[PDB]
Amino acid sequence: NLAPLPPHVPEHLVFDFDMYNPSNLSAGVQEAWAVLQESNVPDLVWTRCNGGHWIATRGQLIREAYEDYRHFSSECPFIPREAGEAYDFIPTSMDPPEQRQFRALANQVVGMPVVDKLENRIQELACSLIESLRPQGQCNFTEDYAEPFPIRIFMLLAGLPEEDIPHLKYLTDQMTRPDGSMTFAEAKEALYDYLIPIIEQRRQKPGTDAISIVANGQVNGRPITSDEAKRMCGLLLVTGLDTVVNFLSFSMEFLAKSPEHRQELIERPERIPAACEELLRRFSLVADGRILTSDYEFHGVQLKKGDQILLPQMLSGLDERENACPMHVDFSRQKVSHTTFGHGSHLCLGQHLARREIIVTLKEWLTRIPDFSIAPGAQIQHKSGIVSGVQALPLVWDPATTKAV
Numbered sequence: 488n489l490a491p492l493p494p495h496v497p498e499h500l501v502f503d504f505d506m507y508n509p510s511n512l513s514a515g516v517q518e519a520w521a522v523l524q525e526s527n528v529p530d531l532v533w534t535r536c537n538g539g540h541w542i543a544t545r546g547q548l549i550r551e552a553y554e555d556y557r558h559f560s561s562e563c564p565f566i567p568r569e570a571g572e573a574y575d576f577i578p579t580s581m582d583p584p585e586q587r588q589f590r591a592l593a594n595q596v597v598g599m600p601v602v603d604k605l606e607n608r609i610q611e612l613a614c615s616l617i618e619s620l621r622p623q624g625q626c627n628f629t630e631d632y633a634e635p636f637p638i639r640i641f642m643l644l645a646g647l648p649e650e651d652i653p654h655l656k657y658l659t660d661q662m663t664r665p666d667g668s669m670t671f672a673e674a675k676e677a678l679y680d681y682l683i684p685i686i687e688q689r690r691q692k693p694g695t696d697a698i699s700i701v702a703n704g705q706v707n708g709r710p711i712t713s714d715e716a717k718r719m720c721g722l723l724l725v726t727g728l729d730t731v732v733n734f735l736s737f738s739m740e741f742l743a744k745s746p747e748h749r750q751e752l753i754e755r756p757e758r759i760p761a762a763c764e765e766l767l768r769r770f771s772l773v774a775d776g777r778i779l780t781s782d783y784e785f786h787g788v789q790l791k792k793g794d795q796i797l798l799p800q801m802l803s804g805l806d807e808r809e810n811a812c813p814m815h816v817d818f819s820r821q822k823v824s825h826t827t828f829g830h831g832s833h834l835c836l837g838q839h840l841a842r843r844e845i846i847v848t849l850k851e852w853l854t855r856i857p858d859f860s861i862a863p864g865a866q867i868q869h870k871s872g873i874v875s876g877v878q879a880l881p882l883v884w885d886p887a888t889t890k891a892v
């Protein structure tokens with residue numbers, strides 16, 4: 488239901504947006520969040536949904552808030568409060584100065600130099616998945632590619648068996664888009680239950696995989712603790728299993744619906760990187776936030792110590808103040824402004840991996856299956872949460888229009 492309005496919040500600022508089930512969800516998840524940017528809606532509103540919390544609705548305030556870690560702390564970054572309180576992943580639950588030492592370690596496992604180590608495997612897996620599908624003339628995109636492609640790359644990098652994917656993917660989904668079977672804290676404890684013996688094993692007998700690297704790592708010249716190792720590795724599983732998986736489906740849904748845009752990339756494949764950036768703006772999908780460390784007046788609004796504020800990464804690039812005609816996809820857009828990978832000191836470490844996976848998917852799919860569409864009569868359903876997503880994506884094509892490479 489709606490939580491009682493706290494005394495410090497003016498009634499004129501209330502807008503009861505539900506981030507886990509927004510009212511306009513049938514029109515598409517980005518469209519549903521974009522209701523927060525309609526002419527009647529203030530820059531900063533309070534929703535009584537999900538325990539009650541602020542929402543910044545415009546890219547200027549979202550950016551400003553992500554920059555100001557002094558007032559807007561990452562200690563409690565998820566809504567609802569019980570999720571944000573339980574949330575203890577590293578580095579994401581930490582503020583500078585303490586956060587930074589852990590970033591460098593995490594960067595060692597998921598950063599640009601590891602994208603180079605994985606380059607050929609990424610390329611090979613994309614091609615082999617797509618070639619297997621190509622003659623079928625149809626697929627369920629979410630299960631047949633969007634999941635297996637980034638997840639199998641992640642499980643390889645982490646040296647975890649592919650048979651563990653259904654369990655880990657269930658747990659990860661409960662943290663970002665819960666179905667009600669588990670609280671965030673239960674899902675977290677089950678993820679840690681999984682990781683504890685693995686971290687033990689790999690500190691005793693280190694391998695080359697990402698878990699071994701983290702668990703035997705140093706932070707600013709000193710040994711990482713077992714606890715600390717567990718809390719990153721937890722973060723890495725979540726990051727490996729959810730965002731790219733969902734983003735791929737938004738992108739491919741759009742391409743299936745937009746022959747002109749597919750055409751553009753088939754005829755001008757050099758535009759694929761710019762196209763990746765524009766889709767990252769248009770189909771942005773993350774929304775977490777921060778907790779107020781003290782009473783603070785922010786843009787004429789009185790925020791109180793301990794208030795949660797949702798700072799939707801998704802909204803900055805959709806803000807017409809940042810990008811003209813923001814719901815239009817324009818691969819030639821001159822300045823693509825977005826905060827899809829976050830903003831400030833927690834800027835996504837995985838972004839170089841993500842872009843590689845997106846760019847590879849677009850190139851290799853369009854090479855083999857240039858001409859495809861949504862299955863006739865299918866209605867595509869989205870789901871909203873910390874990371875929003877696509878429930879299912881049935882595609883079809885004529886195998887006669889495809890090319891085995």
Ligand code: HEM
Pocket residue numbers: 561564577578579580590593597722723726727730731734772773775776800826827828829830832833834835836837838840841
């Ligand atoms: C399209 C795909 C992706 C999107 C949209 C995305 C988005 C984000 C966002 C918005 C944050 C910041 C959260 C905050 O400020 O509270 C973040 C942090 C992070 N991401 Fe990603 N991400 C993607 C892919 C990945 C991948 C594939 C990995 C793993 C290889 C990854 C690893 C991380 C890590 C380790 C952090 C934490 C950095 C820190 O807290 O200092 N991300 N991501």
Ligand SMILES: CC1(C)[C@@H]2CC[C@@]1(C)C(=O)C2
Pocket residue numbers: 576579663725726730773774775873874
């Ligand atoms: C909000 C995020 C995208 C960011 C990386 C994974 C994620 C789900 C987090 O818990 C922090």
Ligand SMILES: [C-]#N
Pocket residue numbers: 725726727730835837
């Ligand atoms: C990041 N996910």
Ligand SMILES: [K+]
Pocket residue numbers: 562563564571572573574575580
């Ligand atoms: K916490």
